[PDB]
Each structure stands twice: as C-alpha cells, then as structure tokens.
Amino acid sequence: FCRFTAEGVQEIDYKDIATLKNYITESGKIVPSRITGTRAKYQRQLARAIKRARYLSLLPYTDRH
Amino acid sequence: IKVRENEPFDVALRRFKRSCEKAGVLAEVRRREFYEKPTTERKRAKASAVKRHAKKLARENARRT
Amino acid sequence: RKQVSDGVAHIHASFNNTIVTITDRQGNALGWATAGGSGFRGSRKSTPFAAQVAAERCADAVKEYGIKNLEVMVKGPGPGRESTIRALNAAGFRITNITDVTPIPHNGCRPPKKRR
Amino acid sequence: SLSTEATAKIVSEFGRDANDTGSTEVQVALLTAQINHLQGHFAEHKKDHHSRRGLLRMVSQRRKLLDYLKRKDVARYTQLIERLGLRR
Amino acid sequence: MRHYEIVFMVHPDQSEQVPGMIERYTAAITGAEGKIHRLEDWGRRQLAYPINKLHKAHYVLMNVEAPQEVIDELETTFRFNDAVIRSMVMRTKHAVTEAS
Amino acid sequence: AVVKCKPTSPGRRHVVKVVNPELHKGKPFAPLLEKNSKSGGRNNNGRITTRHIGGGHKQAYRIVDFKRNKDGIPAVVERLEYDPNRSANIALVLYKDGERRYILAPKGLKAGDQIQSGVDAAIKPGNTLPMRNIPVGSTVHNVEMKPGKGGQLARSAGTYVQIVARDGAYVTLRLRSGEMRKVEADCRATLGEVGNAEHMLRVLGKAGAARWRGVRPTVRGTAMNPVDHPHGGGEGRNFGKHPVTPWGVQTKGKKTRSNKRTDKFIVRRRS
RNA sequence: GCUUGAGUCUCGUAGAGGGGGGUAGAAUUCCAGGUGUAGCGGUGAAAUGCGUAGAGAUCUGGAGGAAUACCGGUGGCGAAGGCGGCCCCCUGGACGAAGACUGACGCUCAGGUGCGAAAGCGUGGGGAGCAAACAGGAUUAGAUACCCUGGUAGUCCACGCCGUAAACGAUGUCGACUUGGAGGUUGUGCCCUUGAGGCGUGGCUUCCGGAGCUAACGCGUUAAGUCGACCGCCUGGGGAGUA
C-alpha cells in the first residue's frame, strides 16, 4: 500500500530485474495493483517493463519453461 | 502451480492453486467466447461491488441486537 | 524391465474421466490406468473415488519396475487431481514434488460455444 | 509534423517576426505547409481515416481564415493566394 | 538524430567475435555521424526460457544516437547475421547512466 | 494496371487488360534476339503430338539469361520490356563492364535499380546467390535444380518459392503447388517474387483472343463419334461412361506419377 | 477599434487514437518418430464417433494459421462505429503551465460529402480453432430445435461494394447560470522531501443525493433544473417502414 516507484522517483526500467522481479508472482504472472499498491501510471510502465523483459529472456513468461 | 515442500512434509496443501490458475481462469476458457458478456458481467460484477462497498459502511442502525 | 528408480506420474484429470500415467525421468510411459478402465462406467467415472482406484491400479504394472519416489504432474480440472495424489501416498511412494501443467493459453484459439 | 525548425521559418516569412506568430496570413501558411506535408502521408496508407479527419479539420480552418481575409482586406488576400499557390 | 537503445543477444559459442562485433557496428554509426553513449556489455548470463533451445546467451547494450536511415540498415544486419539472436530497439527520450 | 473495357461491341464487353505503363515501347534489344518458329504440335514424324495448338502471332525469342553466371559485378537495370514467350516481363540489365543481358523482372524492380549475382551479393530483391547463403524463410524465385543448370523452378509471372529448411547439404523448398522438395544446397536462386502478378487477372474477352495466342479450339469428347474418342456417340447427349482421355486412360483422379529416380528429393506430395 | 469567444506559437504530459511493417511466447490442431497399452471421447443418462491397422495418455522435433492469459481497472483514447502482446516507422486529437500574437475570424446547419459493428456480396489468397447450412446419434407424442459427434460457407488478409443494429447514457449540437459528498484518472502551482504529507488549481470520468423539473420512474453542475441559438422529428392502434 506504500507504492515503491512513487516513493523515491521512477521511470520503470526494464533492465533492472532486481526490483522488477518483486512485481511478478511465482508462476510468472504480473501482480495486480490492488495487491502491491502502485500508482496506475507506474503500473502501466511496469507491465510494459515486464513484457519487454519477458521478451529479452530476463524474466520468464511462465514457470513451464 | 509448482510446489516442492522439502522432504519432511507429510501433506501437500497446494494453496497456490486457489491463488493462481486452477479452476478460475480454466473454467472461464472451457467454452463460450461470448465477446459481449465480458462487457456485461464485468459491469454487473462492479455494480454490485460498489453496493457492497457503500452499503456495508452505512449499515449501522439500531436493529435490536 | 531395466529397474527404473524414480518416475513421473502424469495425471490427466478431466471432467469426464481421470487418466493416470506413470512415466520415467526421460518421459516415456511405463503403465497407465483410467477411471473407466477400473469399472465405474458412466456417471461414477467423474468421481474422486474413481480416480483413487485408477491410482491404485496404476501402482501395479509398475511393480515390476520398482519405482520408489515420483514427481507428480497433474493436468486439468475435475474430480480427480487431488484425491489421486493422496492415493499415491497410500500406495507406498515418495512424493518428490507436485506441479500443475494445466495447458492454459494466452488467449489463443476460440473455444467452443456449448452448454445451453 | 511541422517541426519547430519548420514552424519558425514560416512565421518570419509571413509575419512581422518570430514574435508575431498568430497573425492571419501566418496561420494560412502554417496550415498550408502541413496540408502539403500530409499529401505524402496520404499518398500511401489510403485508409488512415482517423488522421484524414485531422487533415479535414485544417483544410476547412484554412478555408474560413482565407474567407475572413477576403472580407477583412482584399489587398492582403490577393497577395497570399499567389504567394502560397492555391487558387484556380 | 533520434536516440536509441539496442539490446541484442549473441549465440554463445561465437562470443569471441563480440568485441569484433561491437567494433563492427559502432564503426557504422560513428562513421555515419552518430554518437554512441553506453556500451554496457553485460556478458554471458542465464536465460529465463530456452531460445532454439540454446541456453545462456550473451547480452550487449549499446544506447546509441543515430539518424534513422542508419539504424534501419543496422537492423537488417541483425536479421541476416546468424550470430545475433533476438535483438530489440527502443525509445529515445534521453541517454542513460549505466543502469546495471 | 487492371483496365476494364467498355462494351462498345460484343467481344469487347468482357475484356480485361493488364496495362503496365513501365514497359518499354520500342523495338527490343536486337543482339539478344533470335527467331522462334511455330511447331503446330508436330514432331520429327510430322504427326500432331500436342493438340489444340497452332497459329497465333509471330514472335521472336528473347534470349533470357536465367543462369546468372556473372559473379560479383554491379548491374544497373536499364528498362523493363515485354517478352511474348513468357507470362512474366523481362528486364534489360546493363552490367558495369558493358554487357547487356535479359533477366526475369522481379516484383519491386524498376529501371535504374541495381542487381548483382554471386555469393558476396546482398539480400536485396533481385540478386542471385546460392542457397547456402540465402537466409532460411525468405522468398526466392528463378530456382535451379542442379548447380549450373540455369534455373527451372518459379519463373512464371507472380510465382515464388519460399525456402523452408536447411538440413545439411539440402535446401527444403516449398514449391508453388504446395510441394515440399529438396534441392542441392549449392544451387542459385534470385530473391523476391516474380513481377507481372496481375497476369492472372486478364480474362481475354472474346474467342479471337485465344486464337492469336496459338490456342486452337478444343472439341469435347461427347460431341464426337465412338471411333474418334472413347466418349462420344449416342442419340442426343449420352455420356454413361467413366471419363477418360482420348487414348483411354482414366482422367479426373488417376495419378500418373511414376518415375522412381527423383522420389528421393520429394518430401511431401502435392495436397 | 478593444478584448473577456474562437484561433496560432513556444515547452511538456498521459493514451488499446490511426495506418504500415516486423517479432515474441503459451495453447489448440495436424504430421513424423520413440515408449506404452485397452480403452478414449461424450452425456442428465446414453449412443453416433475414435481405437488392437494400435488410439487416448506421454516425450522430442517439425509445419501452419488465428487470437493476445497475467497486467486490467462503472480505467484510458476516439466524432461515433470502435481500438488490448512487445517493437520500429509515418500520423491525428486532447490537455496543462507561463507568456506573446490575431482581433469576433464564431455557433448551428436543409440539400451535399465523408466515415460507419456485425452479417452479406465481388476478385485474389489463407484456412489452426470455432462454426450457419448439412449428415449422423439422442431426447421426444413429434423434434426438419435446444443436447452429442462431425462439418461447408464464413470469421482471416489485400482491394472494392453494402450502409444497417437495442448504431442505446433509447437523451441532437453549442453557450451561460444554479447547493453538496465520496471516488477514479491525467496535468500543474504552493508548502516541510521536512517520513508513503499539507494546500490550491485545470481537463476527463463513476456513484449517491439538495432545490428544481417529471405523469411517475427517475435526472439531478458531463440536468431530463433555469435560458438562449440553430437543426432533426412526432400527431390514435393496426394496415405499414408496407404497396
């Protein structure tokens, strides 16, 4: 409930998978904003950062890989 | 989805199935494209959720109990 | 017969039937049993007790392989999937890990329209 | 598109200076320069109907400004349509 | 001159030619008046999913500024090269600051 | 482009022209021409061996270089021309050393554009280069069967062959009919589709438009006597027979593929 | 002439706005091979269907097409229809801040012109899944239906035509005015970033309700209140959106 990208400052980078793996669940799905608490601007950046890191094989699409 | 439950466990308790995929997003895809009711029943899901939100806080009456 | 040591228990639970197939580490099968192949034809096939006897009747015909610990891969919805894995404990196996290999698409081809 | 480099080149060519940016003859040339730019965009693609509507918003706005200009001062009008090349 | 980022992965047994390849493309852009800014070479690391299976590819980040005709002649080079596996190109906005 | 004629007379009512304005409108390049004499369907023995051909307009053979044996020389496409022997158009191609040759004109090729052949050549549409250097998946045309043979496959108008797979020293080609077929990996191919893809839309309007293409009338089997065709005869349009050729072999279904010498190179038959 | 309407410029801000190309992954289907064996599939119950010529299950590899799970939200964009993977290219609009400029250039619009879901048509492709029609099996008094097993057009793409929908907030477009509350979303200024705050200010949006209106239901500052400007339309039910 204490949104992390609105707290300091951010544009959600796709390369730093350290913070980016905090916002995926165990099966590779993106966690909704009602759970984490991110602002909706930082949620649209996040999904575009998950999917672009899922492209470059940094994060997985699913756990069936 | 996937659970390992390191060698002394004695019981499965796969609780991430009710949290990820098991029958929620699978009974939804077993039939019925609809193309139309994900506009209609998504509306009625949240039309009743806001009457679960507003009418629950203002339910404070005497009611003899 | 080769005396395989650890195997994989693919459990394909459907609404109509539960098929339980025991493979090996490579993934080629060593014996299977269904809810329909154990009697239980028709309405009793779609029951959790029928997957239980499909689990015990898959525990033999791999008695000639000597499988000790097995990794579970349940797949699909239905009345099995949860009472068959309690019957693989009761058959005398070790459960290494359980997964869920339900083939969920990412909004792929159109499903059918039925049940009206 | 009408970049900042291209916008300032037409304001000084048709107005007092770069400060006089909203004059009547300036706006006609700015709408003309973008319509003549978008002839290349709609030479291909041929079905961009949502951007065609923006093109017709600025054809018709240029038609109303030139018709304001012809009523307001005819002398400044006949300068412009020969200088900018749009009359039969 | 729009800015770019170019993350291309490399087929891993041909990773010796990568400083040959980083030189190969930064000659095409600086040679055609385009500034390179962050050659953050990530090295070899592990993949999340198999990619023709081929585990553990080799990552190169560029972050170039370049005219658009050059960055398209660059991107048709990544197709025909058999060493580049899954490149991508991105938005301008800026240059970056090594962003590990 | 695709011009529909106005019905000013019968016959002109159903004409569709395929009008290319980029074609050359002069007498063609005279050193690369030699004569083409009509056969009529007749051989050594003089007897008609292919029916329904004969007549037509006189047409001179354009020596078209399918083989593309000019490795690593720049070549500027001079002008697109009409070849009556083909369905496709041909491009007059000037090399840098001063030699002109005809090639088939691909889809995007215009006058002034540059092609070249050889293994060094780029993957620009129009270049000829061997298939062990062509990328997998890309679309080629003017495909060779044997190395140095010249080019056999995908050389009609609009036709192309997509390259499917490369398993060792063979290239798996999906032919235009839908047939998967292996060739030698050292055979050449020209990239891109063949131009004049609106050739399929010409519908010729009238009966005389096929007579000046050499195609003579086809007489049906049922209109003949029983001595002439294995159909034929009968009082008033009797057929009652399984359909056959004029020499008795079953048509409409009967497969005539029996070679056994080239069945190694075929992966899938035509479906 | 003037500037409070409208407009132009300079910096930014969000967006499934639009067209063009490319690519990614999961799944379905089919083919090819390995293992393996008598069932699978389906239903309220069955049967047709499939399968010892070895299916189903399972593994690997291949070929194709179409759609984008999670994000995802009475959330966002667009004039409406509508638009969801990520990427690049070419573009439209809206909004905000500070100014500077034009000087009423405006609003509505019969006829006209453009756009316009889906189904349909035309020509050329593509065809995985789904699926009218059609065949078979069931259910039934009947069942040319729901249910089951199959399956053609079609959905797909390029280019034309059609011009219709419960094309619906059943609510024309534009402007001004008249108590509030809780939210969302996108800017922006002040103040302590002083610790995930405190205060103004704009645009869009959802819900509840005050006067007022309404036949009532209800709308209720994105009015169905108080007014103005133009336009479209209505005149008992059928017959008839028919000849």
Protein structure class of chain C: alpha/beta
Task: Supply the CATH superfamily name of chain D.
Answer: S15/NS1, RNA-binding
Strand order of the largest sheet of chain C: 3-2-1-4-5
**Radius of gyration of chain D, whole Å:** 14 Å
Assign the CATH class of chain D. Mainly Alpha
InterPro entries (chain C): Ribosomal_uS11, Ribosomal_uS11_bac-type, Ribosomal_uS11_CS, Ribosomal_uS11_sf
Subunit structure (chain C): Part of the 30S ribosomal subunit. Interacts with proteins uS7 and bS18. Cross-links to IF-3. In stalled ribosomes contacts ribosome rescue factor SmrB.
Pfam family, one (chain C): Ribosomal_S11
Function (chain C): Located on the platform of the 30S subunit, it bridges several disparate RNA helices of the 16S rRNA. Forms part of the Shine-Dalgarno cleft in the 70S ribosome.
3D architecture notes:
This is part of a larger assembly, with chains A (65 residues), B (65 residues), C (116 residues), D (88 residues), E (100 residues) and F (271 residues). Chain A has four helices and no strands. Chain A has 65 residues and is mainly α. Helix content of chain C is 16%, strand content 30%. By secondary structure, chain E is of the alpha+beta class. Chain E has one domain (1-92). Chain E is 26% helix and 23% strand. Chain E is globular. The chains are: A mainly alpha (65), B mainly alpha (65), C alpha/beta (116), D mainly alpha (88), E alpha+beta (100), F mainly beta (271). Chain A binds chain B through residues 25-27, 29, 63, and chain B through 1-2, 16, 20-21. Chain D binds one RNA strand of 243 nucleotides through helix 1, helix 2 and helix 3. Chain D: One of its GO terms (molecular function) is small ribosomal subunit rRNA binding. Chain D: This is Small ribosomal subunit protein uS15. Chain D: Keywords: Ribonucleoprotein, Ribosomal protein, RNA-binding, rRNA-binding, Translation regulation. Chain D: Part of the 30S ribosomal subunit. Forms a bridge to the 50S subunit in the 70S ribosome, contacting the 23S rRNA.
